Amino acid sequence: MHTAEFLETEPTEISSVLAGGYNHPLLRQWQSERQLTKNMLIFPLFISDNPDDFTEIDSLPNINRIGVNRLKDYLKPLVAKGLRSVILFGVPLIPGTKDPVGTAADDPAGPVIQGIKFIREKFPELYIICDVCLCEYTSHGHCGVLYDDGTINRERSVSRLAAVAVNYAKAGAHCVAPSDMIDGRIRDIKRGLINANLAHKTFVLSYAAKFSGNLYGPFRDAACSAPSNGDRKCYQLPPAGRGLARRALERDMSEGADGIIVKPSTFYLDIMRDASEICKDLPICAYHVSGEYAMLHAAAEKGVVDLKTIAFESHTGFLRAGARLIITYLAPEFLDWLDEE
């Protein structure tokens, strides 16, 4: 009958033996090129036009649209648990606010500058990062200023973004993160910071490799950011575009970026690996996007995977791919889990 066959074997070659290095829990930690800490997390905030808001973003699980009068109460516990940095997103809901040139982007009375001022006052230890773009302030919803045909107007756009970025810094933001993907904007923003004598104190965190895609769905709802006048495929990198992303990282670093962001994250981990060699001397940051975030929550509610587990796996994945920073909506969770782990 059928019996278990066992082939004759030669002695074990030492080169085949990797096992001695990961047979214990501690060894699996010794094995990571980088360990996850609380200071590597950056939590995004969607600041509202209505100071009393604390609105539910149905498509973005456990994330709200917070007004300034509701900020101290929200941030107090996070900061008490170790939060070190936040990234501001403005959501001006007052009518009449939006226009073709994103005028309200740097409005001193707008949510962003208002949130910056509030934070520097009630939380002077928090590191403030401000996303820099016009999508949330333009009536057309696109990332920059358009020509009449509907296409983006590079020089006028970068000219505008540069101003917004300097204005945020002038207001007190420690860092500026342009996520517009428009050619040459980093150079203009850096030059603008230098002319304002703010470049020696403003970190420029560029979204150097930001891809077009099906993963920004819930963020559009939270920032009321959806475009009008098509897709964003002309400035956002195509998903298969690895050469463009590689040339965009070299460009941005050359133009002054002090750090880079890869976005999305899980779906673009190989891109983080590339940036790790090209921008080896700068901090790399992974952005765990709204759609990657809600995809983890759905699969988890479906029983497919376990939230905490897959969150740790995915997040250590960023650090493995080369990132040392992470912008993620799971920050409140991690600020808790890291106490234990």
Return the one option of its own copies, Zn ion, none that residue 76 interacts with (CB less than 5 to 8 A, by type): none
What amino acid is encoded at 13 in this protein? E
Return the one option of its own copies, Zn ion, none that residue 273 interacts with (CB less than 5 to 8 A, by type): its own copies
Question: What mask of x and - would describe binding to its own copies in positions 80 to 119, judged by CB under 8 A?
Answer: -------------------x-xxxx-xxxx----------
State the minimum distance, in angstroms, from the CB of residue 232 to Zn ion.
Answer: 8
- State yes or no: 175 annotated in a binding site: no
Using CB under 8 A, pick the residue from 3, 125, 148, 340 that binds its own copies: 3
C-alpha 290/C-alpha 89 separation (Å) is 13
**Pairs from 96-102 (Cβ < 8 Å, separation ≥ 24):** 97/49, 97/137, 98/137, 98/138, 98/139, 99/137, 99/138, 99/139, 100/138, 100/139, 100/140, 100/145, 100/146, 101/134, 101/138, 101/145, 101/160, 102/134, 102/137, 102/138, 102/145, 102/160, 102/164
The residue (of 19 and 80) whose beta carbon lies closer to its own copies is 19
Is 263 a catalytic site residue?
yes
The residue (of 225 and 328) whose beta carbon lies closer to Zn ion is 225
Are 316 and 32 a contacting pair, CB within 8 Å? yes
DSSP code at position 211: B
Instruction: Kindly report the length of the chain.
Output: 341
Using CB under 5 A, pick the residue from 47, 135, 145, 237 that binds Zn ion: 135
Tell whether residue 49 is a contact of its own copies (CB under 8 A).
Answer: no
Given 76, 81, 201, 263, the catalytic residue: 263
State the minimum distance, in angstroms, from the CB of residue 237 to its own copies.
Answer: 7
- State yes or no: 147 annotated in a binding site: no
Return the one option of Zn ion, its own copies, none that residue 221 interacts with (CB less than 5 to 8 A, by type): none
SS3 39: helix
Is 210 a catalytic site residue?
yes
41-48 and 325-328 as β-strands: parallel, antiparallel, unpaired?
parallel
At residue 210, what are phi and psi to the nearest 5 degrees?
-120, 115
Given 210, 280, 302, 308, the catalytic residue: 210
Tell whether residue 180 is a contact of its own copies (CB under 8 A).
Answer: no
C-alpha 311/C-alpha 328 separation (Å) is 10
State the minimum distance, in angstroms, from the CB of residue 338 to its own copies.
Answer: 15
SS3 324: coil
Return the one option of its own copies, Zn ion, none that residue 227 interacts with (CB less than 5 to 8 A, by type): none
In order, the DSSP letters of 52-69 are T-EEE-TTSTT-EEE-GG
Site for its own copies in 234-293 (CB under 8 A): 234-235, 237-244, 246-248, 251, 254-256, 258-259, 266-274, 280-283, 291
Using CB under 5 A, pick the residue from 83, 126, 133, 330 that binds Zn ion: 133
**Phi-psi region for residue 224, left (φ > 0), alpha (ψ -120 to 50) or beta?**
left
Residues of the shown chain interacting with Zn ion in the complex, contacts defined by CB under 5 A: 133, 135, 143
Catalytic residues: 210, 263
Which residues line the annotated binding site for Zn(2+)?
133, 135, 143
